[PDB]
Amino acid sequence: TKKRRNNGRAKKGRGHVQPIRCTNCARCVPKDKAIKKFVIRNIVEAAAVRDISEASVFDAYVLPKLYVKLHYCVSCAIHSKVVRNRSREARKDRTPPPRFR
Amino acid sequence: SLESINSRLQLVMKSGKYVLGYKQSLKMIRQGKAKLVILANNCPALRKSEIEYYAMLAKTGVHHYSGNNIELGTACGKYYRVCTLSIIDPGDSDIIRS
Amino acid sequence: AKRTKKVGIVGKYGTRYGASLRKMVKKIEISQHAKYTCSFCGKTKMKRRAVGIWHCGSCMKTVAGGAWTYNTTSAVTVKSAIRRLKELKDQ
């Protein structure tokens, strides 16, 4: 049974897309099929921000961010609950979950 | 400009007049009927210097073709080798007006 | 007419020395007995006199070259690299 119109990936007129490496394991995944996270976080997270702020030698020091991009095979993505299975008609929508918080 | 000079040579040897070969190009230069001389890049240095000296004496232009005698001949459309050739009558081609 | 199926110049060795040795000597034999075109006159009169020595029958010009080929890819790449090195040295 043809489960997805596009075969779980984004290859339309290529024929070949280069493979990348998963981050959790080392599974070799085509680049367009992999699930890609782009997390942007501070170095200190939420509770130490006050501690370094008072201990800083500078006045009003803007704490740096940490930009790391993640790649996931389907197995790790399901097992880490970054993505979960949905109902058959709910599979068709492809707007990302809300980004308010 | 190699493509364009190939085109001009094809037209010149379709319509105008020419001589192929060192010992006959020398005769044409000495008689003064040679309008242009063309030399392949692998002709002997002694004779190319000789041809340059004759052309300087006779006030004639010389062109150093950018290929050896085999494809100079093929550009001429002949099935043999030419090292130096002389255009005597440009005909309906702008080889002199380069 | 065509007198042999696989063996060419190495047909003179008969059934000796092994199929693989005959195959790997065939191409070298062809290369060393071929006639090459002279870059100095345009005629195909280049013969291997001795190993490493090539001669033109018309120019009477002698060139130092490969053992079985007129020139080797190592020689040509060295020549190109040396030209580039001189170009860089004189800027």
Next chain:
Amino acid sequence: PLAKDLLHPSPEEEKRKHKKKRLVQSPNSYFMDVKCPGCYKITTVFSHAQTVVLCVGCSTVLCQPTGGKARLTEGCSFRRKQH
């Protein structure tokens, strides 16, 4: 629309359609006369000239070939001619 008239299309939509796809085939290019600002004679130049056109006497160049309509050198005016 079921009953749309194919026989008598308005000049609006009949202009937007592809040159080969009109009801009657028609070219979108024309002829024009270009005059140099200095020289006096008028020369006939195709709209999509495709060649470097220079007025006789080599006074100047008129139009430069491009991917579509030939761009005209400045100062030169033109007017399209018909019959």
Next chain:
Amino acid sequence: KTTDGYLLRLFCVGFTKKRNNQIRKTSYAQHQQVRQIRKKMMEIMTREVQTNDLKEVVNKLIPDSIGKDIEKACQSIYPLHDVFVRKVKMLKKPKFELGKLMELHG
């Protein structure tokens, strides 16, 4: 190379800028536009450095003066905003001279 024998590698980076009017999402550049932008940076950078000594070059690097010139020069090709000298590597330096160092220190 500078007037004094310091040989440098200057890496500059630029990012095409979306317009305020723009509705389109992509804001990419044609490959020929990219090719003539990076030969504009490559042309400008050498001129700003090869004509004067190390200390003059450093004074340009303290602000983004070289990067600012790149901003103005390539607006007519494609508008692009985040330009800096991403990195400067010093490859070869002349023979050490104690006299010249003291000029750098006053």
Next chain:
Amino acid sequence: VRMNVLADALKSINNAEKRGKRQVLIRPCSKVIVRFLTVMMKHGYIGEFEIIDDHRAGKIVVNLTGRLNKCGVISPRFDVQLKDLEKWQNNLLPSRQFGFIVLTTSAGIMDHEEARRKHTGGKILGFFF
């Protein structure tokens, strides 16, 4: 490539009649097409049409009624004697009261009922009803 212009003309009319339009544009024109529709004209299946004359194979705009069920073409153009004509109309016509097989004879392009009326065989072109 385009191989049988009459096959394209009748397939185009059949799609536009099937969708309920009022006019069809037939892109290539030929004597065979013009002579075929005039046969369909005489029996009231289509309205009057018009051929547009560019200096190439012209176009045709055909007024449609709601009476056409199907028009078709038979490929290849088989030859049919008077003995074979009853069997052909047994195969590809709905009933014995209506429907027509257009077939060209030496007397001209013309449908089956009267082609029998002047005792001439011919080559089958198509059918409509």
Next chain:
Amino acid sequence: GRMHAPGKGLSQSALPYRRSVPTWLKLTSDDVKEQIYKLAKKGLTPSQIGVILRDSHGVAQVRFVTGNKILRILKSKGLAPDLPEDLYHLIKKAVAVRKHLERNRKDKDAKFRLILIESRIHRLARYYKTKRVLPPNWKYESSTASALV
């Protein structure tokens, strides 16, 4: 679609309905075809003789001003090229590819296109032998094709 490509392009010239001559065109037939004559002697295929006439001299179609077409005018005079131009330009291109392919043997795409080009030469060559403009024994030899440009 294209004979040796998967593209389906529709771009083509669209000739106007009116096959008369415009009133603003003052050149008569006789001096147009001497204009054609001298352009042949400059050295130009009939393809671009008609090009430099409809953008500088205003003649929309030579076949509408005269009764003949350009290549038919030329051979009626004696200035036609020996082999047809469209076959000439294939041989000229196949020689260039064959030369480039000769210098670097790892160009597989060049080898693939050379098969395509030399296929179009043979398809066209046997057409001109059916219409009898080439001798029945005319053959395309890859070695000798360099001499005739």
Next chain:
Amino acid sequence: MRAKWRKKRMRRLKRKRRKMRQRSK
């Protein structure tokens, strides 16, 4: 018994058959 391994088994068996055949020819 997945077809890939079944085919591999068949190839090994065929190779053995062939060897045993030119041993006798």
Next chain:
RNA sequence: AAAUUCUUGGACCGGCGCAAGACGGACCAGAGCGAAAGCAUUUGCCAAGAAUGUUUUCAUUAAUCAAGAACGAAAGUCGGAGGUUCGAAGACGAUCAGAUACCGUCGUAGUUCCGACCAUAAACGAUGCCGACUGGCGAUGCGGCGGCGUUAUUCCCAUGACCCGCCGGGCAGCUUCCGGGAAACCAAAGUCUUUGGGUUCCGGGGGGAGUAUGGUUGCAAAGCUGAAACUUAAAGGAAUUGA
């Protein structure tokens, strides 16, 4: 979770250099180019190509194609060069009832390049090619055409960057009682019992079996062509309700 392993003869860690061979992130997209396999640092050179523009030229030169031909990932084979990482085989440490495995450390052939073979992949869109017709809508890439207005060069023309449309090819998308289909679904997988646009390949219940044999290709591995005896009432596809 540990152990094999390295470690006061100074490991791991911090700094400065040097060498070597791989690889080309982020930008990178349901974007592009190519006959497909495939293709991603800069610059240069060489040859090719689609689409668009065309009031240029020839005038049917075309379409699909047994036999035959060119390319064909990975693995594999043969000669050389090189061998950083990874890593078939192998070795040891774990786990286990066993563990010739999954986990860990080391590690050979290979992985890299040059020149020759091999011709198979879920080589997939599981969907021949050419041609015509049948709904909309918003996009995206290329070329062309037109138009308010912003923004550079500035010194205005004109070219760039946005914006608003139109045309032709292209990759896709959303929606639909077009129609079809066993259905899943498909603007083609429609225009089919209202059955005929052209043409190529190819299937005839499940196994035996892509097997035996013969022939042919290859250095080999294997490729292509390819049965029968015998056995068996089912094997299978889409969807439904349960467990």
